Every structure is written in structure tokens, then in C-alpha cells.
Design a protein around this motif. Structure first.
Motif, short mmCIF file in Angstrom:
data_model
loop_
_atom_site.label_atom_id
_atom_site.label_comp_id
_atom_site.label_asym_id
_atom_site.label_seq_id
_atom_site.Cartn_x
_atom_site.Cartn_y
_atom_site.Cartn_z
N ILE A 17 0.83 -1.20 0.00
CA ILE A 17 0.00 0.00 0.00
C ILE A 17 0.86 1.25 0.00
CG2 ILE A 17 -1.88 -1.06 1.33
CD1 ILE A 17 -0.71 0.35 3.80
N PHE A 18 0.17 2.39 -0.13
CA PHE A 18 0.66 3.68 0.30
C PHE A 18 -0.17 4.06 1.53
CE2 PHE A 18 1.89 3.75 -4.22
CZ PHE A 18 3.21 4.19 -4.12
N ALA A 19 0.52 4.44 2.61
CA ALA A 19 -0.09 4.89 3.85
C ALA A 19 0.13 6.40 4.02
CB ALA A 19 0.53 4.14 5.03
N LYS A 20 -0.94 7.10 4.35
CA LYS A 20 -0.94 8.54 4.46
C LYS A 20 -1.05 9.00 5.92
CE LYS A 20 -0.87 12.69 2.78
NZ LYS A 20 -0.59 13.55 3.95
N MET A 21 -0.14 9.86 6.32
CA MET A 21 -0.22 10.50 7.63
C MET A 21 -0.01 11.97 7.45
SD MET A 21 1.16 7.53 10.14
CE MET A 21 0.61 8.50 11.57
N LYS A 22 -0.57 12.73 8.38
CA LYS A 22 -0.55 14.19 8.32
C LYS A 22 0.88 14.71 8.31
N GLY A 23 1.15 15.67 7.43
CA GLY A 23 2.47 16.27 7.32
C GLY A 23 3.39 15.48 6.42
N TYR A 24 2.97 14.33 5.93
CA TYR A 24 3.87 13.42 5.21
C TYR A 24 3.29 12.99 3.89
CZ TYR A 24 7.04 13.17 9.09
OH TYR A 24 7.96 13.48 10.03
N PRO A 25 4.15 12.68 2.91
CA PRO A 25 3.67 12.12 1.65
C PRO A 25 3.15 10.67 1.80
CG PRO A 25 6.07 12.04 1.74
CD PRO A 25 5.62 12.82 2.93
N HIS A 26 2.25 10.30 0.90
CA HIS A 26 1.79 8.92 0.78
C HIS A 26 3.01 8.06 0.70
CE1 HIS A 26 -1.68 11.36 -0.48
NE2 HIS A 26 -2.46 10.31 -0.16
N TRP A 27 3.14 7.13 1.65
CA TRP A 27 4.39 6.43 1.92
C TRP A 27 4.26 4.97 1.63
CZ3 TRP A 27 8.28 9.58 4.34
CH2 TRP A 27 9.49 8.93 4.52
N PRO A 28 5.24 4.41 0.89
CA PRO A 28 5.20 2.98 0.60
C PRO A 28 5.19 2.10 1.85
CG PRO A 28 7.40 3.84 0.18
CD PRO A 28 6.47 5.04 0.36
N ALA A 29 4.22 1.20 1.91
CA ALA A 29 4.03 0.44 3.12
C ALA A 29 3.39 -0.91 2.86
CB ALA A 29 3.21 1.27 4.11
N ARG A 30 3.26 -1.70 3.93
CA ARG A 30 2.56 -2.96 3.88
C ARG A 30 1.64 -3.16 5.10
NH1 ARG A 30 7.81 -6.13 5.06
NH2 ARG A 30 7.74 -6.21 7.38
N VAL A 31 0.58 -3.92 4.90
CA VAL A 31 -0.22 -4.42 6.01
C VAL A 31 0.47 -5.64 6.63
CG1 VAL A 31 -2.49 -5.22 6.71
CG2 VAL A 31 -2.21 -3.69 4.74
N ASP A 32 0.65 -5.61 7.94
CA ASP A 32 1.25 -6.70 8.69
C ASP A 32 0.16 -7.52 9.41
OD1 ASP A 32 3.81 -6.03 7.99
OD2 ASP A 32 4.39 -5.33 9.98
N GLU A 33 0.55 -8.67 9.95
CA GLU A 33 -0.32 -9.46 10.85
C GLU A 33 -0.48 -8.72 12.21
N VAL A 34 -1.61 -8.92 12.90
CA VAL A 34 -1.81 -8.37 14.27
C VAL A 34 -0.87 -9.11 15.22
N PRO A 35 -0.09 -8.37 16.04
CA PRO A 35 1.05 -8.94 16.85
C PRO A 35 0.81 -9.99 18.00
CG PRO A 35 0.78 -6.57 17.28
CD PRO A 35 -0.15 -6.89 16.14
#
Length: 95
Positions: A17-35
Motif C-alpha cells: 500500500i501507500f499509507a498517508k499520515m498528516k504532514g507526510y507524503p503517501h508512503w510505501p508500506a505494507r499491512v502486517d499481521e496483528v502482533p
């Protein structure tokens, strides 16, 4: 993201995915398993490529990678960003 992919079950562990947070660009990311706690109920565990940081994010801040590669997958000056772009295409299972 909102309406298009707006439920946590629209994503599964391993999805890129791309994950978006305030102040930051859409960032390359992944969904992980719940810990694994009491994780937040309507959020997914997210791993950010390049920085290797983590967060819990709702579907509104999550965009599928392939569909959005051309729009969000451009180099950025933010630290770790360009390495993240490398990881998501070449080492998407890095831990």
C-alpha cells in the motif's frame, strides 16, 4: 481509502500500500499481521518501507500500491522514502 477500500477487511496481511499520515507524503508500506495487547478495533497494523517504522491506521489512510504506483510512487526528499520505494518493489518482505 474512503468508500473505494474503506473497510479493514478490504486489506490482508502482506498487501502492499501507500499509507498517508498528516504532514507526510503517501508512503510505501505494507499491512502486517496483528502482533499478539488490545489492538485498535477498526485499524490495521502498518509497516512503512524505508524507515521500517510502524503504526495502526484506518482504511481512510490506506491506498492499494499497484493502482497508485504512478501517482504516489515518485522519489521524495523525505529521509528513507526512496529506499522505501526500492523495498516495496524489490524486498517487500523485509522485517
Amino acid at each position: 481509502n474512503l468508500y473505494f477500500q474503506g473497510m479493514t477487511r478490504d486489506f490482508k496481511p502482506g498487501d502492499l500500500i501507500f499509507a498517508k499520515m498528516k504532514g507526510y507524503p503517501h508512503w510505501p508500506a505494507r499491512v502486517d499481521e496483528v502482533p499478539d495487547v488490545k489492538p485498535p478495533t477498526n485499524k490495521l497494523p502498518i509497516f512503512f518501507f524505508g524507515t521500517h517504522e510502524t503504526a495502526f491506521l484506518g482504511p481512510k489512510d490506506i491506498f492499494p500500491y499497484s493502482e497508485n504506483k504512478e501517482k504516489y510512487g515518485k522519489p521524495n526528499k523525505r529521509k528513507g522514502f526512496n529506499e522505501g520505494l526500492w523495498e516495496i518493489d524489490n524486498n517487500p518482505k523485509v522485517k
